[PDB]
Scaffold this active site. Structure first.
Site, PDB file in Angstrom:
ATOM      1  N   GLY A   1       7.903 -25.312  37.165  1.00 17.81           N
ATOM      2  CA  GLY A   1       7.240 -25.055  35.870  1.00 17.81           C
ATOM      3  C   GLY A   1       5.984 -25.893  35.673  1.00 17.81           C
ATOM      4  O   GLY A   1       4.917 -25.304  35.420  1.00 17.81           O
TER       5      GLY A   1
ATOM      6  N   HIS B   1       4.049 -39.710  34.078  1.00 18.90           N
ATOM      7  CA  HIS B   1       4.950 -38.664  33.516  1.00 18.90           C
ATOM      8  C   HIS B   1       5.975 -38.196  34.556  1.00 18.90           C
ATOM      9  O   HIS B   1       5.618 -37.352  35.411  1.00 18.90           O
ATOM     10  CB  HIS B   1       4.174 -37.467  32.963  1.00 18.90           C
ATOM     11  CG  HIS B   1       5.064 -36.564  32.187  1.00 18.90           C
ATOM     12  ND1 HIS B   1       5.906 -35.664  32.799  1.00 18.90           N
ATOM     13  CD2 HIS B   1       5.302 -36.475  30.865  1.00 18.90           C
ATOM     14  CE1 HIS B   1       6.607 -35.032  31.881  1.00 18.90           C
ATOM     15  NE2 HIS B   1       6.251 -35.508  30.687  1.00 18.90           N
ATOM     16  N   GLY B   2       7.215 -38.689  34.432  1.00 19.31           N
ATOM     17  CA  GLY B   2       8.352 -38.358  35.316  1.00 19.31           C
ATOM     18  C   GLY B   2       9.235 -37.263  34.737  1.00 19.31           C
ATOM     19  O   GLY B   2       9.349 -37.182  33.500  1.00 19.31           O
ATOM     20  N   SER B   3       9.844 -36.454  35.608  1.00 21.15           N
ATOM     21  CA  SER B   3      10.705 -35.303  35.237  1.00 21.15           C
ATOM     22  C   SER B   3      11.674 -34.994  36.383  1.00 21.15           C
ATOM     23  O   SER B   3      11.490 -35.546  37.483  1.00 21.15           O
ATOM     24  CB  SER B   3       9.852 -34.108  34.886  1.00 21.15           C
ATOM     25  OG  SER B   3      10.551 -33.203  34.048  1.00 21.15           O
TER      26      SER B   3
ATOM     27  N   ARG C   1       3.919 -28.525  29.051  1.00 24.25           N
ATOM     28  CA  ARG C   1       3.990 -27.759  27.780  1.00 24.25           C
ATOM     29  C   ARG C   1       4.619 -28.657  26.718  1.00 24.25           C
ATOM     30  O   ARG C   1       5.356 -29.578  27.098  1.00 24.25           O
ATOM     31  CB  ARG C   1       4.787 -26.463  27.967  1.00 24.25           C
ATOM     32  CG  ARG C   1       3.939 -25.264  28.381  1.00 24.25           C
ATOM     33  CD  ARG C   1       4.743 -24.063  28.865  1.00 24.25           C
ATOM     34  NE  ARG C   1       5.396 -23.271  27.823  1.00 24.25           N
ATOM     35  CZ  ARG C   1       6.152 -22.191  28.052  1.00 24.25           C
ATOM     36  NH1 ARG C   1       6.347 -21.766  29.288  1.00 24.25           N
ATOM     37  NH2 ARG C   1       6.707 -21.538  27.044  1.00 24.25           N
TER      38      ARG C   1
ATOM     39  N   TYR D   1      12.923 -40.586  33.910  1.00 23.85           N
ATOM     40  CA  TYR D   1      13.140 -39.172  33.500  1.00 23.85           C
ATOM     41  C   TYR D   1      13.210 -38.254  34.727  1.00 23.85           C
ATOM     42  O   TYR D   1      13.423 -37.035  34.551  1.00 23.85           O
ATOM     43  CB  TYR D   1      12.073 -38.726  32.499  1.00 23.85           C
ATOM     44  CG  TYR D   1      12.160 -39.442  31.176  1.00 23.85           C
ATOM     45  CD1 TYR D   1      12.931 -38.946  30.135  1.00 23.85           C
ATOM     46  CD2 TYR D   1      11.493 -40.642  30.980  1.00 23.85           C
ATOM     47  CE1 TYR D   1      13.026 -39.615  28.926  1.00 23.85           C
ATOM     48  CE2 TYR D   1      11.582 -41.324  29.780  1.00 23.85           C
ATOM     49  CZ  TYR D   1      12.353 -40.811  28.752  1.00 23.85           C
ATOM     50  OH  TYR D   1      12.431 -41.479  27.564  1.00 23.85           O
TER      51      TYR D   1
ATOM     52  N   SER E   1       8.792 -43.920  33.066  1.00 22.02           N
ATOM     53  CA  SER E   1       8.563 -42.496  33.409  1.00 22.02           C
ATOM     54  C   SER E   1       9.450 -42.143  34.608  1.00 22.02           C
ATOM     55  O   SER E   1      10.197 -41.152  34.530  1.00 22.02           O
ATOM     56  CB  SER E   1       7.104 -42.208  33.658  1.00 22.02           C
ATOM     57  OG  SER E   1       6.421 -41.943  32.440  1.00 22.02           O
TER      58      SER E   1
ATOM     59  N   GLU F   1       4.687 -45.946  24.437  1.00 23.13           N
ATOM     60  CA  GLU F   1       4.744 -44.485  24.716  1.00 23.13           C
ATOM     61  C   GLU F   1       3.478 -43.831  24.167  1.00 23.13           C
ATOM     62  O   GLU F   1       3.106 -44.120  23.006  1.00 23.13           O
ATOM     63  CB  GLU F   1       5.957 -43.816  24.078  1.00 23.13           C
ATOM     64  CG  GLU F   1       7.263 -44.375  24.584  1.00 23.13           C
ATOM     65  CD  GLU F   1       8.490 -43.579  24.185  1.00 23.13           C
ATOM     66  OE1 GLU F   1       8.317 -42.499  23.564  1.00 23.13           O
ATOM     67  OE2 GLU F   1       9.611 -44.037  24.505  1.00 23.13           O
TER      68      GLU F   1
HETATM   69  N1  LIG Z   1       5.837 -26.060  31.330  1.00 21.20           N
HETATM   70  C1  LIG Z   1       6.899 -26.668  30.792  1.00 21.20           C
HETATM   71  N2  LIG Z   1       7.811 -25.919  30.134  1.00 21.20           N
HETATM   72  C2  LIG Z   1       8.927 -26.508  29.691  1.00 21.20           C
HETATM   73  N3  LIG Z   1       9.312 -27.781  29.826  1.00 21.20           N
HETATM   74  C3  LIG Z   1       8.387 -28.499  30.474  1.00 21.20           C
HETATM   75  C4  LIG Z   1       7.167 -28.042  30.945  1.00 21.20           C
HETATM   76  N4  LIG Z   1       6.443 -29.077  31.514  1.00 21.20           N
HETATM   77  C5  LIG Z   1       7.240 -30.111  31.405  1.00 21.20           C
HETATM   78  N5  LIG Z   1       8.443 -29.829  30.812  1.00 21.20           N
HETATM   79  C6  LIG Z   1       9.592 -30.728  30.738  1.00 21.20           C
HETATM   80  O1  LIG Z   1      10.303 -30.473  29.542  1.00 21.20           O
HETATM   81  C7  LIG Z   1      10.889 -31.700  29.069  1.00 21.20           C
HETATM   82  C8  LIG Z   1      10.433 -32.023  27.646  1.00 21.20           C
HETATM   83  O2  LIG Z   1       9.444 -31.465  27.199  1.00 21.20           O
HETATM   84  N6  LIG Z   1      11.101 -32.957  26.937  1.00 21.20           N
HETATM   85  C9  LIG Z   1      12.192 -33.828  27.388  1.00 21.20           C
HETATM   86  C10 LIG Z   1      11.822 -35.287  27.145  1.00 21.20           C
HETATM   87  N7  LIG Z   1      11.548 -35.517  25.720  1.00 21.20           N
HETATM   88  C11 LIG Z   1      11.262 -36.928  25.434  1.00 21.20           C
HETATM   89  C12 LIG Z   1      10.049 -37.521  26.134  1.00 21.20           C
HETATM   90  O3  LIG Z   1       9.050 -36.852  26.367  1.00 21.20           O
HETATM   91  N8  LIG Z   1      10.171 -38.828  26.459  1.00 21.20           N
HETATM   92  C13 LIG Z   1       9.316 -39.609  27.275  1.00 21.20           C
HETATM   93  C14 LIG Z   1       8.782 -40.809  26.806  1.00 21.20           C
HETATM   94  C15 LIG Z   1       7.993 -41.582  27.650  1.00 21.20           C
HETATM   95  C16 LIG Z   1       7.730 -41.177  28.952  1.00 21.20           C
HETATM   96  C17 LIG Z   1       8.269 -39.976  29.410  1.00 21.20           C
HETATM   97  C18 LIG Z   1       9.048 -39.192  28.584  1.00 21.20           C
HETATM   98  C19 LIG Z   1       9.475 -37.951  29.310  1.00 21.20           C
HETATM   99  N9  LIG Z   1       8.893 -38.172  30.626  1.00 21.20           N
HETATM  100  C20 LIG Z   1       8.189 -39.314  30.733  1.00 21.20           C
HETATM  101  O4  LIG Z   1       7.605 -39.698  31.743  1.00 21.20           O
HETATM  102  C21 LIG Z   1      10.457 -34.635  25.280  1.00 21.20           C
HETATM  103  C22 LIG Z   1      10.819 -33.182  25.516  1.00 21.20           C
HETATM  104  C23 LIG Z   1      10.513 -32.785  30.090  1.00 21.20           C
HETATM  105  O5  LIG Z   1      11.540 -32.938  31.061  1.00 21.20           O
HETATM  106  C24 LIG Z   1       9.240 -32.210  30.705  1.00 21.20           C
HETATM  107  O6  LIG Z   1       9.020 -32.713  32.017  1.00 21.20           O
END
Ligand SMILES: Nc1ncnc2c1ncn2[C@@H]1O[C@H](C(=O)N2CCN(CC(=O)Nc3cccc4c3CNC4=O)CC2)[C@@H](O)[C@H]1O
Length: 340
Positions: free
Chosen positions: A200, A191-193, A207, A236, A233, A317
């Protein structure tokens, strides 16, 4: 008086410079809206100009019924666009584009508010035990196999350099996960961000997107999305040639019976008996090479052509729909060595 790479980590996720850099690349007016005047009182409110706005995109509200709705969005979140009229949130990819901005601003506020309230002092308020897993150990060998092994040939613009690798125990996450510890098919997935989100993520955990958020961008709706191929991942992180060092999580995700969809559903409640969804990839790691750490299914074979074809996803996914189904086990600091 903390270990070296953790002291560097805490700086990297709480670096205010890295936040302000993200706010002008999103084209926010930092004179009309600094980090200080950001409140959660304006967050769900910003989604309020999206929940009751995308609800006026699919009929096309007409600037009798849009102009006003788009207007009140710039009362809470101003934006500077040089010397050109402000983009109108009436089209498809604008109300959505602005949804990725809040997803960041959300945890951009969390970071600052944690940094301002109350480097050991800031670590304290991540409520998480961050330990250093050492390069040479097995611990550090199985993680690396995986990073080396589950790189994709589509996602090969950059090579994947693994800098230093931590072991994470979030407050409560153990207790919370206890129920799902006993559920079959537990996988340590990626899980990348954005580095800014990790304020957060570590403080609050992963979340599920709030209910006010715009519909799509979520292929399978509002869940916590994982993947077996690190690159996907890794992506992202949205790390750029400018700042090439990213953060990617490994997590234990108790998946039980996966609802195996080859095609996008906005799943709005699992079909009783399913505890996860699995988007079916074309490519997948040889299910023969899939190691076991502690009753967890570390999937780290290499790309084999699982000729599963009736599908849209190049790689799998994994989505759960309960925050309790995840148990974050490591945080990886890896460098993106780019090539154009
Ligand atoms: N505590 C939190 N409060 C709010 N946002 C939070 C959180 N913890 C993580 N997030 C961050 O919010 C973002 C989020 O939910 N998103 C943005 C991405 N979107 C599509 C998605 O999940 N695609 C997707 C699909 C496959 C792998 C991966 C992803 C995203 N990261 C991966 O490794 C789904 C909704 C994301 O960037 C996450 O890292």
């Amino acid at each position: 008086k903390l270990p070296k790479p953790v002291q560097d980590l805490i700086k990297m996720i709480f670096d205010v410079e890295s936040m302000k850099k993200a706010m002008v690349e999103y084209e926010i007016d930092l004179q009309k809206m600094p980090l200080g005047k950001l409140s959660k009182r304006q967050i769900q409110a910003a989604y309020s100009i999206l929940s009751e706005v995308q609800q006026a995109v699919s009929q096309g509200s007409s600037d009798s019924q849009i102009l006003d709705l788009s207007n009140r969005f710039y009362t809470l979140i101003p934006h500077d666009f040089g010397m050109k009229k402000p983009p109108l949130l009436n089209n498809a990819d604008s109300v959505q584009a602005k949804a990725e901005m809040l997803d960041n601003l959300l945890d951009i506020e969390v970071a600052y508010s944690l940094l301002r309230g109350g480097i050991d002092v800031n670590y304290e308020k991540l409520k998480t035990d961050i330990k250093v897993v050492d390069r040479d150990s097995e611990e550090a060998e199985i993680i690396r196999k995986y990073v080396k092994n589950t790189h994709a040939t589509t996602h090969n613009a950059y090579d994947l350099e693994v800098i230093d690798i931590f072991k994470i125990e979030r407050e409560g996450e153990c207790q919370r996960y206890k129920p799902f510890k006993q559920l079959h098919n537990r996988r340590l997935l990626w899980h990348g961000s954005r580095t800014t989100n990790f304020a957060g993520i570590l403080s609050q955990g992963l979340r599920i997107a709030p209910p006010e958020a715009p519909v799509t961008g979520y292929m399978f709706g509002k869940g916590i999305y994982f993947a077996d191929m690190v690159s996907k991942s890794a992506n992202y992180c949205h790390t750029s040639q400018g700042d090439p060092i990213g953060l990617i999580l490994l997590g234990e995700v108790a998946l039980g019976n996966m609802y195996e969809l080859k095609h996008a559903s906005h799943i709005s409640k699992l079909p009783k008996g399913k505890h996860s969804v699995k988007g079916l990839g074309k490519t997948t790691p040889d299910p023969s090479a899939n190691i076991s750490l502690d009753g967890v299914d570390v999937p780290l074979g290499t790309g084999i052509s699982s000729g599963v074809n009736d599908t849209s996803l190049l790689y799998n996914e994994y989505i759960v729909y309960d925050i309790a189904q995840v148990n974050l086990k490591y945080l990886l600091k890896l460098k993106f060595n780019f090539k154009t």
